[PDB]
Design a protein around this motif. Sequence first.
Motif, PDB file in Angstrom:
ATOM      1  N   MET A 198      38.503  36.352  29.611  1.00 11.18           N
ATOM      2  CA  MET A 198      38.041  36.981  30.738  1.00 11.18           C
ATOM      3  C   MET A 198      38.392  36.221  32.097  1.00 11.18           C
ATOM      4  O   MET A 198      38.131  34.995  31.874  1.00 11.18           O
ATOM      5  N   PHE A 199      38.521  36.929  33.118  1.00 12.01           N
ATOM      6  CA  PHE A 199      38.636  36.331  34.380  1.00 12.01           C
ATOM      7  C   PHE A 199      37.754  37.137  35.422  1.00 12.01           C
ATOM      8  O   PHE A 199      37.838  38.332  35.472  1.00 12.01           O
ATOM      9  N   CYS A 200      36.754  36.542  36.147  1.00 14.12           N
ATOM     10  CA  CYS A 200      35.936  37.344  37.198  1.00 14.12           C
ATOM     11  C   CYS A 200      36.735  36.899  38.637  1.00 14.12           C
ATOM     12  O   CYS A 200      36.653  35.870  38.987  1.00 14.12           O
TER      13      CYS A 200
ATOM     14  N   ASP B 245      46.715  38.314  31.505  1.00 11.43           N
ATOM     15  CA  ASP B 245      46.824  39.511  30.909  1.00 11.43           C
ATOM     16  C   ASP B 245      45.417  40.036  30.121  1.00 11.43           C
ATOM     17  O   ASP B 245      45.376  40.887  29.247  1.00 11.43           O
ATOM     18  N   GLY B 246      44.291  39.103  30.509  1.00 16.37           N
ATOM     19  CA  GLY B 246      42.975  39.325  29.780  1.00 16.37           C
ATOM     20  C   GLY B 246      42.371  40.112  30.408  1.00 16.37           C
ATOM     21  O   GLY B 246      42.828  40.947  31.376  1.00 16.37           O
ATOM     22  N   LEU B 247      40.930  40.267  30.070  1.00 10.86           N
ATOM     23  CA  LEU B 247      39.883  41.075  30.597  1.00 10.86           C
ATOM     24  C   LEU B 247      39.698  40.673  32.121  1.00 10.86           C
ATOM     25  O   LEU B 247      39.658  39.488  32.386  1.00 10.86           O
ATOM     26  N   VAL B 248      39.458  41.396  32.990  1.00 14.77           N
ATOM     27  CA  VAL B 248      39.182  41.365  34.533  1.00 14.77           C
ATOM     28  C   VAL B 248      37.941  42.124  34.781  1.00 14.77           C
ATOM     29  O   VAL B 248      37.845  43.498  34.590  1.00 14.77           O
ATOM     30  N   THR B 249      36.861  41.407  35.440  1.00 13.73           N
ATOM     31  CA  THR B 249      35.951  42.103  35.944  1.00 13.73           C
ATOM     32  C   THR B 249      35.804  41.544  37.454  1.00 13.73           C
ATOM     33  O   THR B 249      36.175  40.759  37.850  1.00 13.73           O
ATOM     34  N   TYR B 250      34.915  42.341  38.136  1.00 12.13           N
ATOM     35  CA  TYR B 250      34.308  41.949  39.298  1.00 12.13           C
ATOM     36  C   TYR B 250      32.692  42.060  39.275  1.00 12.13           C
ATOM     37  O   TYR B 250      32.436  43.076  38.814  1.00 12.13           O
ATOM     38  N   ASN B 251      32.044  40.930  39.663  1.00 12.77           N
ATOM     39  CA  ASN B 251      30.776  41.090  39.865  1.00 12.77           C
ATOM     40  C   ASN B 251      30.014  41.121  41.136  1.00 12.77           C
ATOM     41  O   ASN B 251      30.073  40.314  42.070  1.00 12.77           O
TER      42      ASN B 251
ATOM     43  N   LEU C  34      35.976  45.966  33.520  1.00  4.11           N
ATOM     44  CA  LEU C  34      34.470  45.995  33.039  1.00  4.11           C
ATOM     45  C   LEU C  34      33.872  45.717  34.186  1.00  4.11           C
ATOM     46  O   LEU C  34      34.319  45.066  35.168  1.00  4.11           O
ATOM     47  N   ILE C  35      32.885  46.701  34.519  1.00  2.00           N
ATOM     48  CA  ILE C  35      32.059  46.758  35.531  1.00  2.00           C
ATOM     49  C   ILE C  35      31.084  45.494  35.590  1.00  2.00           C
ATOM     50  O   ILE C  35      30.428  45.305  34.384  1.00  2.00           O
TER      51      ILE C  35
ATOM     52  N   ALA D 278      28.145  53.274  34.735  1.00  2.00           N
ATOM     53  CA  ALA D 278      28.843  53.046  33.960  1.00  2.00           C
ATOM     54  C   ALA D 278      29.556  54.645  33.277  1.00  2.00           C
ATOM     55  O   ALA D 278      30.824  54.531  33.189  1.00  2.00           O
ATOM     56  N   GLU D 279      28.800  55.650  33.142  1.00  2.00           N
ATOM     57  CA  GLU D 279      29.183  56.893  32.622  1.00  2.00           C
ATOM     58  C   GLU D 279      30.343  57.378  33.468  1.00  2.00           C
ATOM     59  O   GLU D 279      31.291  58.059  33.135  1.00  2.00           O
ATOM     60  N   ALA D 280      29.931  57.655  34.649  1.00  2.00           N
ATOM     61  CA  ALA D 280      30.629  58.138  35.798  1.00  2.00           C
ATOM     62  C   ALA D 280      32.214  57.565  35.817  1.00  2.00           C
ATOM     63  O   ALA D 280      33.197  58.087  35.957  1.00  2.00           O
ATOM     64  N   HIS D 281      32.428  56.170  35.673  1.00  2.00           N
ATOM     65  CA  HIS D 281      33.721  55.399  35.929  1.00  2.00           C
ATOM     66  C   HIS D 281      34.253  55.265  34.356  1.00  2.00           C
ATOM     67  O   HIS D 281      35.379  54.662  34.424  1.00  2.00           O
ATOM     68  N   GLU D 282      33.448  55.715  33.376  1.00  2.00           N
ATOM     69  CA  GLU D 282      34.178  55.589  32.162  1.00  2.00           C
ATOM     70  C   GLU D 282      34.673  54.120  31.837  1.00  2.00           C
ATOM     71  O   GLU D 282      35.875  54.128  30.953  1.00  2.00           O
ATOM     72  N   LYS D 283      33.852  53.219  32.146  1.00  2.00           N
ATOM     73  CA  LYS D 283      34.040  51.579  31.894  1.00  2.00           C
ATOM     74  C   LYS D 283      32.589  51.204  31.238  1.00  2.00           C
ATOM     75  O   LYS D 283      31.482  51.794  31.947  1.00  2.00           O
ATOM     76  N   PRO D 284      32.818  50.362  30.400  1.00  2.00           N
ATOM     77  CA  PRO D 284      31.439  49.723  30.122  1.00  2.00           C
ATOM     78  C   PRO D 284      31.009  48.820  31.434  1.00  2.00           C
ATOM     79  O   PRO D 284      31.702  48.135  32.254  1.00  2.00           O
ATOM     80  N   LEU D 285      29.880  48.513  31.357  1.00  3.52           N
ATOM     81  CA  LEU D 285      28.950  47.722  32.537  1.00  3.52           C
ATOM     82  C   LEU D 285      28.401  46.526  31.593  1.00  3.52           C
ATOM     83  O   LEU D 285      27.753  46.699  30.651  1.00  3.52           O
TER      84      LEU D 285
END
Length: 314
Positions: free
Chosen positions: A140-142, A169-175, A192-193, A215-222
């Motif tokens: 992952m990368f933040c 190419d890995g998972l990207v999140t913003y914190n 990911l949120i 999370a549910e609104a954006h259809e993304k895990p938090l």
Amino acid sequence: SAFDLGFIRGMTFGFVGQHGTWGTDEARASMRALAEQPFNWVTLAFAGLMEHPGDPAIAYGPPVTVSDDEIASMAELAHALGLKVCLKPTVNCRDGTWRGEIRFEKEHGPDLESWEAWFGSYSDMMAHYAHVAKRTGCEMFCVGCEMTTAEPHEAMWRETIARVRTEYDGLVTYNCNHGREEHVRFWDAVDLISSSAYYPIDRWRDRVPVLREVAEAHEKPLFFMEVGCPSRSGSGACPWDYRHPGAVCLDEQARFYEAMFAAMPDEPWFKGYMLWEWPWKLYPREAASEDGSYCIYGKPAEDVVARAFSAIAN
Ligand SMILES: OC[C@H]1O[C@@H](O[C@H]2[C@H](O)[C@H](O)[C@@H](O)O[C@@H]2CO)[C@@H](O)[C@@H](O)[C@@H]1O
Ligand SMILES: OC[C@H]1CNC[C@@H](O)[C@@H]1O[C@@H]1O[C@H](CO)[C@@H](O)[C@H](O)[C@@H]1O
């Protein structure tokens, strides 16, 4: 990949990542101690430096931060100890101003004190470290942390993220900061949120519905990219505040974790916890009752978290 992601039982290591500190025997010993605990993730976090909150230049790499090879050494060690690794470059101000309050008078102008200038520096930094994340196999990368004043500059955040995707190419999140989950406009651009979930003890019970809704609104895990509390008296009312004065109080830290774990539901949108934090130079357990930091090592919170995380793992 994001949907399938195993629940996160994580710990942040090594902040602020000062040059030379991760290449030490001490840092190696600390990472091994971290891996004794039931964590499946570690975040390698470090900060570049702005002189002032209105300066568009960001210093990173030596002599300020750990070198790329120090990052690689720690990532290699973590991976060989069975941990997944998130790389988290962020930025601090030398004068102590929080990065969530950076500000410029001008929007545009590459050679002016502008948002465009600052994002040019920040985007180069993120591209640099996204490439390091690829080199080192970080899972992952933040792309940012608590940048509340920057968040309205949506086009610039999207440019930054797109550049990270070209390099990584890995998972990207913003914190985002606690209280910003329902405000950020670009969650569609990350996998990911995540937030710095420093909710007071008494707010966990009533914050959950908004987290669920986002999370549910954006259809993304938090998940929480930072969560913790100092072991100091009263810190449970302001767990975000690293400067809060108080006598050492181990139970207060434990009470934070008990409140959080009580409140968080067992629902698939929630993907877990990246705890704040674990130092590169770890105190011995014999000294833990005199330590007022965020670290849980040698304190009752160690057992609260290990009990919770072992149960999740098993
Ligand atoms: O959340 C971690 C950061 O908290 C900051 O303090 C904020 C706080 O988060 C809330 O936005 C609020 O109650 O106002 C504060 C600004 O004074 C700072 O303590 C940062 O150092 C933390 O990273
Ligand atoms: O207040 C705890 C966290 C909240 N989120 C960002 C992070 O900066 C903060 O931690 C402290 O960070 C400062 C340096 O920025 C450090 O001096 C403290 O000891 C904590 O790590």
